[PDB]
Amino acid sequence: MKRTFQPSVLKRNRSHGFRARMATKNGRQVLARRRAKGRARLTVSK
Amino acid sequence: AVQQNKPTRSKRGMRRSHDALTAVTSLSVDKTSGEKHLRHHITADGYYRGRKVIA
């Protein structure tokens, strides 16, 4: 039976990558929150 | 179907009162080599009833 997750690297990076986060004002707020919490990984980009 | 009350250790033991093992009564002695073996079986060196069968 076909399930929900079906991977694709190009789509992953175009959806949740560093440059996509930087291109909008709310994405920068996501980055600021995560830097303030002190995460070791900031985005999904390798 | 499941229990309504927890059984006791006394009941556990009463049920297990039939679980003991039995030992072998005695062994046999070959008439030529002198080894001990299970009756009607061959010995560990290859004898049965005084004759060498397996080399």
Binding site: - | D19, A20, L21, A23, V24, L27, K36, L38
Partner: protein
């Protein structure tokens, strides 16, 4: 003079090892070895090794004679358990216990 030998953290259940331990309580050592050699159980091998270790200790460290020894005490106690996971139907998980035992044998010339 009594001599001890032990096997700690053995891979078996104490309930299973006691069935074999009960066969040789109070026997002479030669008779006990003969009994253990013709028992078709896995616990028999382990118990036999422990008995042989006890006899060798009594010969080397205490200067005993083989023909005078008897199995004066023997017992099994429970040890730590390992915990594992086993999946079942419809995304439900169950726990598995892997049990161990300690085995103790005491020989004496009295």
């Amino acid at each position: 003079m009594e001599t001890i030998a032990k096997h700690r953290h053995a891979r078996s259940s104490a309930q299973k090892v006691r069935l074999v331990a009960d066969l040789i309580r109070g026997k002479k050592v030669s008779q006990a070895l003969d009994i253990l050699t013709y028992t078709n159980k896995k616990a028999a091998v382990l118990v036999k090794k422990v008995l042989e270790s006890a006899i060798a200790n009594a010969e080397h460290n205490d200067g005993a004679d083989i023909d005078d020894l008897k199995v004066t005490k023997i017992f099994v106690d429970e040890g730590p358990s390992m915990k594992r996971i086993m999946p079942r139907a419809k995304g439900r998980a169950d726990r598995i216990l892997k049990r161990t035992s300690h085995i103790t044998v005491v020989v004496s010339d009295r």
